[model samples]
Target chain A: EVQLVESGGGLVKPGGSLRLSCVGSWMTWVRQAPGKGLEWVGHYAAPVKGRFTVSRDDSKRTLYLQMNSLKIEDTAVYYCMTLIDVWGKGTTVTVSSASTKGPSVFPLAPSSKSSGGTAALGCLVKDYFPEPVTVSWNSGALTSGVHTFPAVLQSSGLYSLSSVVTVPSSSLGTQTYICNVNHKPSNTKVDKRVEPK
Target chain B: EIGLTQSPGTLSLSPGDRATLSCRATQRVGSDYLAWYQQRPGQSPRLLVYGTSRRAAGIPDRFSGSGSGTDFTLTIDRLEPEDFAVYYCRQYETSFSFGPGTRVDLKRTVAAPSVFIFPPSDEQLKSGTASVVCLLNNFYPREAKVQWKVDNLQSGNSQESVTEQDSKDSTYSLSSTLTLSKADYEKHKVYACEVTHQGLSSPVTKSFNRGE
Candidate 1:
């Protein structure tokens, strides 16, 4: 597990660099933990080692994780976990991007499982690392819902995280399920099918 | 889902006694990779068995090990003060995943004794070759067993021990000496000692040579 004891915050200018900080223990098992292994996207971490520091204090039995600088879109929560078997408290980074330009949400799904029918639904966002994202299907289950919506994590700078759930084969028209996307204390929206009358 | 079944969960014993811990998985874990561990008072669990009988990285063999397949057991022949800890059994499903850990604790009852290691010497040899001896003493089966390996591979010279001595704990000992060239010892790739008995997460493995 992470064994997160404490953490720090960050501040930067508009369009400037962004950095988030994290601290914890138990990193040796991160690579072997079941899910949510330490992952870094965007133009940093993978290319440069010094930027994100995952240091350990053997004497004190603790871990220190940090991120740097920030900008408008560099606002969101950063999380550290203990091997993914258990989760730790997260740190949030808030910039002005959530308001002015705001963040748009796109639904996503893995791949086409079957032929023509109601394919999987998805949700997509940019410069967002989970932090504050919640997905819930509304319309209602087992009620002849026209289609299902899934979330997907986008590939590059713009990404998507897709959750694929099956739809029951039954029910009426105008019955649509909505997927609400919320991030970094932002707004929430509902995506529903516009069934014809 | 795969399955596993252990003989008995709790072990009862006393100082200078013996205890046997067994772990049998539901299926043939295929990889034949099982390990043992010990969780003492307020400390991270210590590795006991790896690859079934093979101990982990850095453990004493006064606690010997002998087992195979998913059905395996760790025997502690002698119970000591330091040996008072919770034990565990685990299987490495390939290299990707490790099975859930089985916990071993001090029963402190059931009428018997407990026991077992001091780290070996650290010495530097001349240029050509150096000899090292690993000794496992005063140990009973279920109490502990000792084994030797090179680069994670078991190296057997078929050496045995005599009953030169036995304590109140009803246990004896054995020894193995390995001769390596200075290059191999200096480079320090892999030479390990594993101690096994009941209640271990995995064998403790310590390398002979480490990097600078």
Candidate 2:
């Protein structure tokens, strides 16, 4: 029971990056432009070391394609295909002429707090040119959960992300939590502290 | 090199319309190396026709497949309500390549699934042996893609998704179960269940905390 599907497609500015995912493992990134034939962008096998990086999530049986410093020429229908020809429904990406800047980081804030309970600590990043940005969290106390929500597209054709950290009662107050947002055009690192209100 | 191309990217029909889907190869292909599959929302791809024209086990006689060499066709003589789904043709002579896919859609209304995930058991959570179940029910079209996320990472090797057609309401119920060790769960790690369907613009996700 093996199935593969290519996902993630949207407008990306030139000089930005795009991250595409395939549902099945051991795949090759196949691209087809409007008037072009199928082109082999890269392949994901044992370990990756190249201009494009490939990673396989065995648990999810998925393969990933990370394109860095994207250009308008890179816009095409990308497919994660097995060597034997199993392909996901192709994802069409259109590159817009937006700025080539990364997202601007905002301070982390806490919301949805309850007395002697949990608080939802959130991180926000905006004005990113690329379609996707990776957000990660690190904290001193044991965090109950961490999630980086989907990128919220802005009118400027950039992207914004909201990442949340679930702070448990046992590990709240006066603790510093770190949120890291990574984009190609920016050297991004952001964090915030929870002090006595 | 071998290649496959499917026709009629969209097949819009009613419940009783006879549907015909085609797959053409760039060159000659062996009849024994060809197969056809059916995919509905929130379900796994099913092998409907294999070896040129042979129907898979339990497939209705209304669904018939034939053709050889470079050209092939999958015909559903009298379409049923459940027969409206995407159909794909595959070739194995040179490599396991499939056609682009043609969707057979209905003009009637259908329901989308509401997804839910249950918390892990105490014993399973403590002993590093964990089982998580995600439920998707009350959906029509009987297809879906259910995925599990451990510690917020998407992976497929650890989970199994099974779907059953509800005979009474013509809807579907799907259950995706994930098994892993406590070490995999980690400390206060989050487990999320996500589902994707044709009706959804994005995957609907639900997360479970460390405990109740």
Candidate number achieving the greatest TM-score relative to the actual structure: 2
Candidate 2, residues A89-147, lDDT tens digits: the string is 77877677876676655443442232355555545455676555677666334434554
User: Can you tell me which runs of candidate 2 are displaced by over 4 Å?
Assistant: A1-77, A80-83, A86-94, A114-117, A139-144, A194-197, B1-212
Candidate 1 structure quality by residue, lDDT tens digits, A25-132? 534221111111122222123422454445556676555554443344344445443302233355444433222222353333222222233323323232343334
Worst 10 residues of 2 chain A by lDDT: A42-51
Expressed as tens digits, the lDDT of each residue in B112-183 for candidate 2 is 765656554443355455556565655666568887777767775543333334334545555565656577
CA displacement after TM-score superposition, residue B166 of candidate 2 (Å): 25
**Candidate 1, superposed: residue stretches over 4 Å from native:** A1-62, A65-132, A139-156, A162-165, A172-174, A194-197, B1-212
Provide backbone clash counts, one per model: 94, 15
> Model 1's DockQ?
0.01
- What overall lDDT goes with each candidate model? 0.42, 0.64
